[PDB]
Design a protein around this nucleic acid. Structure first.
Lengths: 534, 243, 169, 126, 158
RNA sequence: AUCCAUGACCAAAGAAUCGUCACAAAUCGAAGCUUACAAAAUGGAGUAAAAUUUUACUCAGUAAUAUGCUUUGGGUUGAA
């Protein structure tokens, strides 16, 4: 069916005995005639996969055409209407008839899975002004002609025009005679003395063989819900000049892309993949420096003090004076160590215990009696084992279809096993505004009734909502997740965040509520979370 | 909502009945107060706590709220309540308030002399306290007398009505209100309005300034006619479970 | 810097306060009776003079001089008694005190001066006044057939006060 | 014949529409999860900026859950606001996806089907 | 009091939860008040809808009611169907389907619609606030003939 | 070759969190809660009664909840 693909791409290495795989990032794979494939990749993972294919170039052939093919992405409702105002054809082709008809939908979610277009356009500099497709005549499009698009598919006419992109000499001939601006101007000027003498045309005519034909492909991405247009490289500039003369067309950068994909409850490869070798670097090595550099470079007292905060938890452990974990990033190493230690503290003694008052100070013995010992173990492991040396590990896997939940003086280290997590989106039922790196706690079994009552609604005698009450607090071993992107969600009118939570935490909740608190604050807001199928 | 809870009922004691012109004036002033913005209203009643209370369980509240004003609780949404202002002067003369509790919703007290004032905060069943701001309050009242009652569920009341009648009463009102504010440390203060006429009523967004430029913090001026005045009414209505 | 300001929108209510009238009870009639026009003996000077009288008596020299520095009456209509006054931001409460503690404007008696809103810019009190008039007209044309209020005390006035005297940008 | 034992996943699609930049600025699609005061404010603010588009009415418009909700709003504008409204009952057709029916994931084969419902359009004048 | 419906500022004694009593009241109280004199009576076979029905038999009944075995030289088959509240969704499923198969014999049909409301008053959040709700009422006339001598200016023609 | 004190010059930066403020509209101001549906429209699923028809009901759970809820406002990577 040659429908577009969007998923996750790995890096296999099976060549000698023991082998494994590690997720890399998104990928776009498009099949053609069962023996040609086109792959689109983010630049960062471009080379690593590429050399892998070069391990079998005895059997395949590869063209690094990233300097010869260009693309443009279009989003919105009136998108195809604007693109169709700057494209004409050379001959009569059915794939332009379908393109003409479907450019009048204005709600692209109704269209089916596959909406590929492919044809040959003329030099867009002929028009000298964008022009409609005379579409106002026909305004009785129904849901019966849409079903025709699934049967009247021009397979051969797509393949023939497509194969003029996977061949360098064909798209070299595509430049056979590219016109300069002045000679196009002279050609247009020659239209003031035409023979019909009753027309007054503006667009220049088209020659049968002394002008180039530009192959062109348009595809639809369903998961991101947008339009790709794929074109030869040096042809991009003439087209892009017209596309920005539409009275209501706007160009966007990369931050707007992040915001758009945030609103639709979807991830974002650079910033929001903490289980990939580069997402982990972007999180724990690139944002942290950019934040600390502007933090410690303020006079003390003109910035938020992080280790001097009062009443964060119900009862205080003397390990951390103030806030938990790093102050500048979503620290996942602490999550792994803390959760693993909490699990080990219940090896056979179900009832945990926080601290015993001055048992002792410390074969390099590091006993695992109290939870304060786990916290000081995590404190020791940082700034004295990886701030003076290097070590790499992926403490964050992704959810797997199989079932490997449980586990257990030989190998009992707290950084040896990856702890599986899942990705969720949390919406706030009451006041709140979750920023980045905020923490996500489970709801304690005690005070569940109070939080449920707050969810249902508690009203003042006046008639409004009651907010100023006594907010109860949980322990420090109730930390189960982090939030990686969050701001005011305009599609619902209330604050919302997206983040990750520990997998074993969610599969044991008797309810579906969580508590959210920012970094450097002690206010706990309530929220409800829903899964994302990624 | 807005709550004003000191509209007087035209009757002096248990002997006389209500005439026609008095109720005619009361209806007009109620309509004006409804126009200005108030929604919930209570009706006052003054006795002396030393008189022969009717023995029967009826006709001890001659307000008759469900026959009169029946055409004002619809055709306009304002709701009405009932209250009585006992005047306490002696530490005796019986008539414990277990009887009139069921026949009203709000019970107040208006002490006159030192013995009465110290009795009122000692052990009664009132849920609100008031003073005679017209003239000559027994002065030098301190936190000692008022702390015990305000720690429990009692509230203080201001009327601002006497600031509108005459200058001579106005001066005494503005003198006594400062004392009562500073003695209670700005805790548990609510505002009523003594409206003897359809002229002596006022809006909201100015009287709050009238109390703010006398000593009350602006954070408390916005809860006098509001949450506290709503809570007193809520408790008074919820007291009706005696039956 | 630049000096701030506050604008106060004040109405005048003329309650009946007379016995042996027994009016009807309905949201239409109460508003239609309380909102009669002004007897035209009041003017733009009478209100200002009376509000100056009510300050130097209920407040002293240091209360009547912190407001009189900037106190101007901009717009006033007789068909509907709405008016607009201007003052300093930090000294607006004293003007409100002058407003309440003042009755019996000039020689006219038995009336209430009612400040209904205060706002910073002048562009917004105009919108508030328009919304207020629209609300009154809607509530007077919904109790029954509108023309049962045929006396036209105010009905022809809200439309015709559009921008006749409100071009004070 | 065949019983519709299609408990497998079904991805309901929005009804096909088409707009003209004049129906964009003079139309409201009342959702099922729309709070009452939300739509009340929206309608109250289109009847103030529709003259410049050369129109004289606002087309509230809804189906399913919306209908009674929609009608309630219409009531609030019929009386207690003194405006004239027109009511039209319409039929609508939408499209539903169904699978053709190792272990494979959600990405299965697709077939389209057509199903019809009924809704109401409600024109509120100025 | 703070209870019960309020139709045209007048208290009524009936319960919204039960449908039959409300339908009876709506049938014999307001319908003649909107559909005015028609020579003191016109051939109008009333029909009320409820959320518990079977649409096939109901549309068969509506088909029968508009043709009394092809009455010749008689009155007009004018039908009036009404509903209120959560039952309205069931009515439009009928009223449209009946119009679908009836135009398969290239015949025309004309209908009129009208909308009114019940008011309801109930206890709000706490014991000091009331809340008032609106419940919709929809009535529709189908004719099978041209304009009728009845007075229909408030109705909408479709 | 070391330290302390006073003075001059250069350079960095210009605190964070929580609560209250009357109107079928509000506030000293602004914004958000519009890709119309529960697969109950291959002409939905069932229960009772009486001679296909007539009369009574059950099934929609993140169910829905009415001028209601949520966010923000002086140098945003100092000088507007």
């Amino acid at each position: 069916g040659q429908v577009l693909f969007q998923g996750l791409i790995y890096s296999f290495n099976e060549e000698n005995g023991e082998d494994s795989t590690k997720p890399l990032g998104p990928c776009d794979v498009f099949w053609v005639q069962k023996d040609t494939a086109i792959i689109r990749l983010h630049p960062s993972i471009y080379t690593q996969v590429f050399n892998i294919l070069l391990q079998h170039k005895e059997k395949l052939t590869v063209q690094d055409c990233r300097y010869s093919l260009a693309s443009v992405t279009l989003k919105g409702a009136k998108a195809l209407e604007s693109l169709a105002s700057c494209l004409r054809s050379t001959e009569y082709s059915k794939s332009f008839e379908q393109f003409k008809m479907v450019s009048m939908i204005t709600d692209h979610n109704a269209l089916p899975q596959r909406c590929t277009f492919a044809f040959e356009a003329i030099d867009p500099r002929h028009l000298a002004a964008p022009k409609k497709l005379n579409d106002s005549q026909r305004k009785t499009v129904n849901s019966d002609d849409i079903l025709s698009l699934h049967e009247n598919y021009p397979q051969d006419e797509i393949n023939a025009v497509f194969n003029e992109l996977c061949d360098p000499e064909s798209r070299t001939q595509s430049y056979n005679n590219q016109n300069t601006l002045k000679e196009i101007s002279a050609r247009r000027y020659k239209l003031l003395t035409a023979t019909p003498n009753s027309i007054n045309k503006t667009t220049v005519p088209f020659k049968e063989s002394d002008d180039p034909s530009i192959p062109l492909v348009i595809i639809r991405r369903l998961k991101t819900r947008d339009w790709i247009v794929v074109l030869p490289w040096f042809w991009l500039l003439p087209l892009w000049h017209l596309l920005n003369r539409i009275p209501r067309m706007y160009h966007i950068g990369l931050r707007q892309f992040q915001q758009i994909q945030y609103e639709n409850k979807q991830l974002y490869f650079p910033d929001d993949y903490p289980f990939t070798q580069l997402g982990y670097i972007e999180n724990s090595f690139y944002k942290k420096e950019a934040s600390k550099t502007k933090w410690d470079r303020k006079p003390m007292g003109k910035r938020i003090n992080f280790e001097k905060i009062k009443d964060i938890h119900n009862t205080k452990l003397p390990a951390y004076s103030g806030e938990i974990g790093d102050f500048f990033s979503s620290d996942w190493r602490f999550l792994q160590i803390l959760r693993n230690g909490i699990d080990y503290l219940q090896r056979n003694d179900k009832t945990l215990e926080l601290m015993d008052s001055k048992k002792t100070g410390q074969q390099g013995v590091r006993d695992i009696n109290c939870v304060n010992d786990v916290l000081e173990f995590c404190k020791d492991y940082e700034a004295k084992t990886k701030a003076m040396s290097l070590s790499i590990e992926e403490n964050i896997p992704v959810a797997l279809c199989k079932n490997r939940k449980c586990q257990f003086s030989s190998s009992f280290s707290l950084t040896f096993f990856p702890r599986c997590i899942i990705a969720v989106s949390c919406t706030l039922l009451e006041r709140g505004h979750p920023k980045d790196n905020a923490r996500i706690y489970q709801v304690p079994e005690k005070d569940l009734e109070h939080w449920l009552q707050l969810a249902k609604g508690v009203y003042r005698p006046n008639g409004r909502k009651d907010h100023d009450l006594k907010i109860p607090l949980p322990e420090v071993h109730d930390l189960i997740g982090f939030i990686t992107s969050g701001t005011y969600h305009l599609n619902c009118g209330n604050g919302m965040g997206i983040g990750f939570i520990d997998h074993h935490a969610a599969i044991r909740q008797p309810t579906r509520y969580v508590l959210i608190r920012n970094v450097g604050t002690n206010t706990y807001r309530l929220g409800e979370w829903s899964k994302i199928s990624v | 909502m807005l709550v004003d809870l000191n509209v007087p009922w035209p009757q002096n004691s248990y002997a006389d009945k209500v005439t026609s012109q008095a109720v005619n004036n009361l209806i007009k002033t109620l309509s004006t107060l409804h126009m200005l913005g108030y929604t919930h209203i209570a009706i006052n009643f003054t006795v002396n706590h030393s008189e022969k209370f009717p023995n029967d369980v009826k006709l001890l509240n001659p307000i008759d709220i469900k026959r009169r004003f029946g055409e004002l609780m619809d055709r306009t949404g304002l709701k009405l309540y009932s209250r009585i202002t006992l005047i306490i002067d002696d530490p005796s003369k019986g008539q414990s308030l277990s009887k009139i509790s069921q026949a009203f919703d709000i019970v107040a007290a208006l002490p006159i002399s030192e013995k009465g004032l110290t009795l009122s905060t000692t052990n009664l069943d009132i849920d609100l306290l008031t003073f005679q701001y017209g003239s000559r309050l027994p002065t030098f009242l301190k936190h000692k007398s008022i702390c015990s009652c305000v720690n429990r569920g009692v509230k203080l009341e201001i009327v601002y009505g006497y600031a509108l009648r005459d200058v001579q009463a106005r001066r005494q009102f503005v003198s006594n209100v400062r004392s009562v504010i500073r003695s209670s440390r700005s805790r548990g203060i609510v505002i009523g309005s003594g409206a003897m006429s359809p002229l002596e009523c006022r809006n909201i967004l100015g009287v709050t300034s009238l109390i703010k430029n006398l000593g009350l913090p602006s954070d408390r001026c916005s809860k006098a006619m509001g949450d506290l005045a709503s809570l007193v009414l809520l408790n008074g209505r919820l007291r009706n479970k005696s039956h | 810097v630049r000096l701030k300001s506050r604008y106060i929108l004040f109405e005048i209510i003329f309650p009946p306060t007379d016995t042996n009238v027994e009016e009807s009870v309905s949201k239409a009639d109460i508003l239609l009776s309380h909102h009669r026009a002004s007897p035209a003996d009041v003017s733009i000077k009478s209100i200002l003079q009376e509000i100056r009288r009510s300050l130097s008596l209920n407040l002293g020299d240091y209360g009547s001089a912190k407001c009189n520095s900037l106190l101007q009456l901009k717009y006033f209509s007789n068909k509907t008694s709405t008016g607009i006054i201007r003052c300093h931001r930090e000294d607006c409460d004293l003007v409100i005190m002058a407003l309440m503690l003042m009755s019996k404007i000039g020689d006219v008696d038995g009336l209430i001066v009612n400040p209904v809103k205060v706002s910073g810019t002048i562009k917004k009190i105009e919108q508030f006044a328009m919304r207020r008039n629209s609300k009154i007209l809607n509530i007077i044309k919904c109790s029954q057939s509108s023309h049962l209020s045929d006396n036209d005390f105010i009905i022809n006035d809200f439309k015709k006060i559009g921008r006749e005297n409100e071009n004070e940008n | 014949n065949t019983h519709n034992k299609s408990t497998k996943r079904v991805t309901k699609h929005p009804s096909l529409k088409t707009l003209t930049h004049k129906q964009i600025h003079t139309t409201i699609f009342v959702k099922s999860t729309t709070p009452y005061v939300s739509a009340l404010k929206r309608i109250n603010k289109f009847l103030d900026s529709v003259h410049k588009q050369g129109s004289s009415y606002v087309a509230v418009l809804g189906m399913g859950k919306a209908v009674e909700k929609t009608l309630a709003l219409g009531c609030h504008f019929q009386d207690q606001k003194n405006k004239k409204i027109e009511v039209y009952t319409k039929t609508i057709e939408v499209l539903d996806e169904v699978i053709t029916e190792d272990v494979e994931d959600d990405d299965k084969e697709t077939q389209l089907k057509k199903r019809a419902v009924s809704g109401v359009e409600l024109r509120i004048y100025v | 009091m703070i209870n019960g419906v309020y139709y045209n500022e007048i208290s009524r004694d009936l319960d919204i939860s039960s449908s039959t009593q409300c339908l009876r009241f709506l049938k014999e109280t307001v319908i003649p008040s909107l559909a005015n004199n028609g020579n003191n009576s016109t051939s109008i076979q009333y029909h009320g809808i409820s959320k518990n029905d079977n649409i096939k038999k109901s549309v068969n009944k509506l088909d029968k009611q508009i043709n009394m075995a092809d009455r010749s030289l008689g009155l007009q088959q004018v039908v009036c169907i009404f509903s209120y509240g959560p039952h309205i969704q069931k009515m439009l499923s009928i009223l449209e389907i009946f119009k679908k198969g009836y135009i398969k014999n290239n015949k025309k049909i004309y209908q009129w619609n009208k909308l009114t409301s019940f008011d309801i008053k109930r206890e709000g959040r706490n014991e000091l606030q009331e809340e008032r709700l609106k419940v919709p009422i929809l009535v529709t006339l189908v004719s099978d003939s041209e304009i009728i001598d009845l007075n229909l200016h408030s109705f909408t023609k479709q």
